[PDB]
Structures are given as structure tokens and as C-alpha cells.
């Protein structure tokens, strides 16, 4: 499934991302755009043998279990991050940023969202 921008903003709002730790909703929509281009099916194998899964490209070395990489800190099979329901990816994403270092753990957000007008990513959506 490939989300539209406003469609994913509305879905992320339903999953508790417009009121999470000061990380306003636009930050998350922008991050999903540059991580996966709004594609929940996106999968990219890293140079170290691990793979990034899902709409927020969650890495399989640390956060999920794919059977070909054993930390699984989100206690989830990596395949579960690929469905059209974004519950699994969001809950895992909330665990990644909540260690203290925050959004700077998000490579695509850090390089393409951080410092821009992130509110534009929810601009024009009737939420």
C-alpha cells in the first residue's frame, strides 16, 4: 500500500503521533516520505546483511526478527512491519526515538526534514 500524504497524516494522527513527546505530526510524515516514499511495502537490504522494513524503514539488526540476520527490541517479526496497517511500525518507531537521543536517530528525518518547515507536510489536510 502506498499512502497519500494527507492519508498518512490522518492515520498517524489516529495512532498517537500528533501528541508524542513534542515530535509534531509533520516530523513523522516527512520522515516516512524520505524513508519509504509512503510505501508500507518498502524493503531495502543494508550493506551489513540487515534489512530495513516498512514505511519507516525499521532496521532488522536491532528492532525486529527476520530469521536471517537477534535483538528484536520491538518484540515483533520484521514481516509485521509490512502490512497496510501501520500500528506495528508506529509502536516500534515510538520505542526507537524514546531512548533519549530522540529524532536524531532518524537518518532520513535528520538529512531531509530537520531544519525545514515540517508543518508543511500536514498543511492542506483536513485533520
Amino acid at each position: 500500500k502506498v499512502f497519500g500524504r494527507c492519508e498518512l497524516a490522518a492515520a498517524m494522527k489516529r495512532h498517537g503521533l500528533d501528541n508524542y513527546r513534542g515530535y509534531s505530526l509533520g516530523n513523522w510524515v516527512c520522515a516516512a516520505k524520505f524513508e519509504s516514499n509512503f510505501n508500507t511495502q518498502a524493503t531495502n537490504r543494508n550493506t551489513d546483511g540487515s534489512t530495513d522494513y516498512g514505511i519507516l524503514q525499521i532496521n532488522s539488526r536491532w528492532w525486529c526478527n527476520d530469521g536471517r540476520t537477534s535483538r528484536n527490541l520491538c518484540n515483533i517479526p520484521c514481516s509485521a512491519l509490512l502490512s497496510s496497517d501501520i500500528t506495528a511500525s508506529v509502536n516500534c518507531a515510538k520505542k526507537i526515538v524514546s531512548d533519549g537521543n530522540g529524532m536524531n536517530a532518524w537518518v532520513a528525518w535528520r538529512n531531509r526534514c530537520k531544519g525545514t518547515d515540517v508543518q508543511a507536510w500536514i498543511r492542506g489536510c483536513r485533520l
Binding site: G4, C6, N111, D117
Partner: protein, 155 residues
């Protein structure tokens, strides 16, 4: 070791530090972790004056980052109209497609930048171009329910 410092200066809008690093033989096409050139970062952060200085010093106007985005991709999506024209007049491909097949027209349409869409159309933006998901700029405007943008693209 100056290229890493020119990247920082370009993204940060240090108009004066960009000049000094340039004259001292800093690589105007240095790449960071994401494959961005100084011209990428200056267009991303809306620093018009640094964009012109990098172009005068021979920056690649169509350099692609690790995902295939050109500086015109980033300027069009962020709504920086001044930079988009400077990039076009200096030989930027108005119909460049990145790794997911998105053009500058796709990126400006996704964020409802009407004025930038019209400038891109004027410079020959292809309204039939599709990303890897089969979407045109028109389809994007419909998905986002942007009626004013749809009208622009319908003619």
C-alpha cells in the same frame, strides 16, 4: 579536509564562510553521508545567495544524491521559488526523475506549491510522467484533495 566544512557552511547559510572556504580550494562537489552536495543542502535550506555562489564556482547543477534527487527536486518540494528559477536558468533538468521516478513536478504538487508548479509547467514539465507507483502530478493533487492544484494541472 575542507569539503566536510563546506557542506556544513552551505546547509547552515553561512554566506561569508562559504566564500572563504571556496577561495581556499575546497571541493565544491563534496558529498556527505546522504550523498548531498553543497548545492543540495543550500537548496534544501532555502539559501538563495549560497546557491548562486556555488553555481559560479562550478557546482554540478544536476548532481544526484543517494536517492537520485537533484537540487531542483529539493527546491521545488520545499517551495523555494527564487532558487527554482536560478536552478532552471543554470541548466537544471526540469524533468529529472529520482530513484522512485518522481519529478520536480511531483514533489511540488505533493506539497501544494501552486506558484512552483506553474513555473515548472512553463519550463516544460511533463504532466504525464509517473513515479514507480504509476502516479502523475494530477493523481497526487486528487489524493490530497487539492482542487486549486488540480485546476492548474488540468490545463
Amino acid at each position: 579536509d575542507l569539503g566536510k566544512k563546506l557542506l556544513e557552511a552551505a546547509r547552515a547559510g553561512q554566506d561569508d564562510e562559504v566564500r572563504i572556504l571556496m577561495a581556499n580550494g575546497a571541493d565544491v562537489n563534496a558529498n556527505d553521508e546522504y550523498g548531498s552536495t553543497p548545492l543540495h543542502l543550500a537548496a534544501l535550506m532555502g539559501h538563495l545567495e549560497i546557491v548562486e555562489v556555488l553555481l559560479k564556482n562550478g557546482a554540478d547543477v544536476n548532481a544526484e544524491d543517494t536517492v537520485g534527487d537533484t537540487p531542483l527536486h529539493l527546491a521545488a518540494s520545499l517551495g523555494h521559488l527564487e532558487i527554482v528559477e536560478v536552478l532552471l536558468k543554470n541548466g537544471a533538468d526540469v524533468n529529472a526523475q529520482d530513484f522512485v521516478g518522481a519529478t520536480p513536478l511531483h514533489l511540488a504538487a505533493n506539497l501544494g506549491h501552486l506558484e512552483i508548479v506553474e513555473v515548472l509547467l512553463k519550463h516544460g514539465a511533463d504532466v504525464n510522467a509517473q513515479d514507480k507507483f504509476g502516479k502523475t502530478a494530477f493523481d497526487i493533487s486528487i489524493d490530497n484533495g487539492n482542487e486549486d492544484l488540480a485546476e492548474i494541472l488540468q490545463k
